[model samples]
Target: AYAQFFSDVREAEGQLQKLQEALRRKYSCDRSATVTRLEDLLQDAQDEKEQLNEYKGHLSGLAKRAKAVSGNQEAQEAVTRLEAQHQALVTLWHQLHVDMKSLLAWQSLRRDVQLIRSWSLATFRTLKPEEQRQALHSLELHYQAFLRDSQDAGGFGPEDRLMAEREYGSCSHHYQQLLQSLE
Candidate 1:
């Protein structure tokens, strides 16, 4: 029983770690502190489970003694307390799992926004000035539509807005540079 409980704890920890690493890679953020803190929390939970498993083992040994002597109420109560601790750890682990999954989904959405920005910038750069202006206008219209779509779909965070503004500023700056070079 102790071995099995330890195995389960290890497996849960491994899975959560993989998910956390994947999110770090996908989001392209150096969230090392956050990841380390999460790992520490998971480790604490695993340690709690290990402690409970040790109590279970102790309870089993006491039960054997009790069968011989017919009294081990204290050991039984210790086992009950350990069981409650294990249950709380399980709940906490499950909640962390859910939160990690939600974070992964948000990271994926942010990546999608990044791809859109890249594609728009590439398409914008491929045009001549008159065509570029037309393209920029069209791109602006497209971005406006995206803003609406993003708002309708629960809105963008500040990062998305900042990125959009930066791209617009870059395109404008490049266009002026090109015009100045023509003279």
Candidate 2:
């Protein structure tokens, strides 16, 4: 039993490590690779989850077996060791599951944020900058929400819509400002 559990942990760890490595590749460059890599680890974890449910189903019977041998110190020791190992490995698996699930949201927002920056720089090129202070003040107000929608786990607003709206409004505002300065 212990051997199987230990082997499961190692195999899961390797799968989790591969997922992490793929995620580190960033979203924009190789999004497809990351998606495929992530799916592999998630499916592997899901398979283990099915096995985990079976294990849990048998747990009560095992508890009864152990209770019957309560006087055996060796049985108690083995149970304690097994309990500790199971908890530690399960903690790792739980974290990996969370990261795998949340990484997509995280990556999507980050990629959108990067697009906002690119769009801003492109718009900036057409700005006349009549007064550096005024232009800076204006742009500052526009981009103040840069990090607002770029969150990893919080804020459930439609970031894609909000970002596009924000970019359009600011670009229009700045373009008008630049036009006035040119006139």
Candidate 3:
């Protein structure tokens, strides 16, 4: 029985390192930069050729700064997730305008979440799926904390506090359900 298992063991010993390196290098050119550049020259584009040439120069700057706040789908989702927490805090601050300390803390949280987005964009990409998973998980943990604090900062009486907490409940539920898909 054990011999049968050994006979089919997929041998990876025959792979060549040099060929792999060349293939890998081919994709190393900034994919994000290329797409951004090509979009300007599409046949459907009605703008002047000169306009297209001028736009190409901006492509490098965008790719280099692309992660700052993802503008496409990934970024839209990021903003939706992170902004949910911030907007909840805004509602709390509106009601508790009489209080001053919460104002200060909420302002700092606002600054912090933007900084967090920038840091992740600048630092958290990889060719490996596992690393990407870990980075996404870590960012969610930060959001959970921020939302929890937003809940507490409202200083609401029982009725308002319940509603305040509920604002984030659906988001938390969806988050768990998505992660649970992995396991």
- Superposition error at 35 for model 3 (Å): 36
| Cα error, candidate 3, residue 144 (Å) | 10
* TM-score of each predicted structure versus truth: 0.34, 0.43, 0.22
Candidate of highest lDDT: 2
Candidate 1 residue-wise lDDT at 67: 34
Ranking by TM-score: 2, 1, 3
In angstroms, the error of model 2 at 128 is 26
Q: Determine the C-alpha RMSD for candidate 3 after optimal superposition of all C-alphas.
A: 28.0
lDDT tens digits, residues 10-67, model 3?
1211122232343233322221334333233232233322333453343333333334
**Tens-digit per-residue lDDT, 1-183, candidate 1:** 444443544454454455444433433322232534434454444554455446456445544543332234643454454445445545554444334433333343344344434534456456566865664565555454444433323224557656665765665566566556555
CA lDDT of each prediction against the hidden true structure: 0.47, 0.48, 0.36
The pairs that clash in candidate 3 are none
Model 1 residue 72 lDDT? 46
Tens digit per residue, CA lDDT, model 2, 1-183: 545443544554454455444433422122343645655666767755565446543443444444455245644454554445445545555655555544444454344444434434446556455643454444444344334432332323357546645754654565556556545
Off by over 4 Å in 3: 1-98, 104-156
